Amino acid sequence: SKYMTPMQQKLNEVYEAVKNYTDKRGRRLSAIFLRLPSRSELPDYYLTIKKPMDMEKIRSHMMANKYQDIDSMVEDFVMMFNNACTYNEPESLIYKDALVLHKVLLETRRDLEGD
Numbered sequence: 001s002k003y004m005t006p007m008q009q010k011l012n013e014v015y016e017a018v019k020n021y022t023d024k025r026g027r028r029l030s031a032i033f034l035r036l037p038s039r040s041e042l043p044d045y046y047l048t049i050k051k052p053m054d055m056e057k058i059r060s061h062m063m064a065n066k067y068q069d070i071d072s073m074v075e076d077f078v079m080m081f082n083n084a085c086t087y088n089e090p091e092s093l094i095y096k097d098a099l100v101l102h103k104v105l106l107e108t109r110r111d112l113e114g115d
């Protein structure tokens, strides 16, 4: 069935807002967050980070209707963004991008408060 419930539509719209956000110079900040590297590729991340998370995990939960509200999705984004900000240095760009997208997430939730 092609038609989404109101909640599915809202979930989808929040996700898409973070995925498609582009800054004033045309860069999609989400590109690096789509998929986390392997355990072999980033051993250090997996030793430090308790709950690994990337946007494909959030997308998979979403497409399996595993999020029953918007708060549950925000929780996983915040986890992802906090992980990036824990592992990477405060002066690094992935740290900074995670913060801008955190703002976009929240700004997108506020925009859609009525809907």
Ligand SMILES: O=c1cc(-c2ccc(O)c(O)c2)oc2cccc(O)c12
Binding pocket: 032, 033, 034, 035, 036, 037, 053, 054, 055, 080, 081, 083, 084, 085, 087, 088, 094
């Ligand atoms: O902290 C993260 C770091 C990386 C990452 C991606 C490509 C790289 O070349 C890298 O050095 C780190 O991907 C991620 C994807 C999702 C969530 C993350 O916190 C991360």
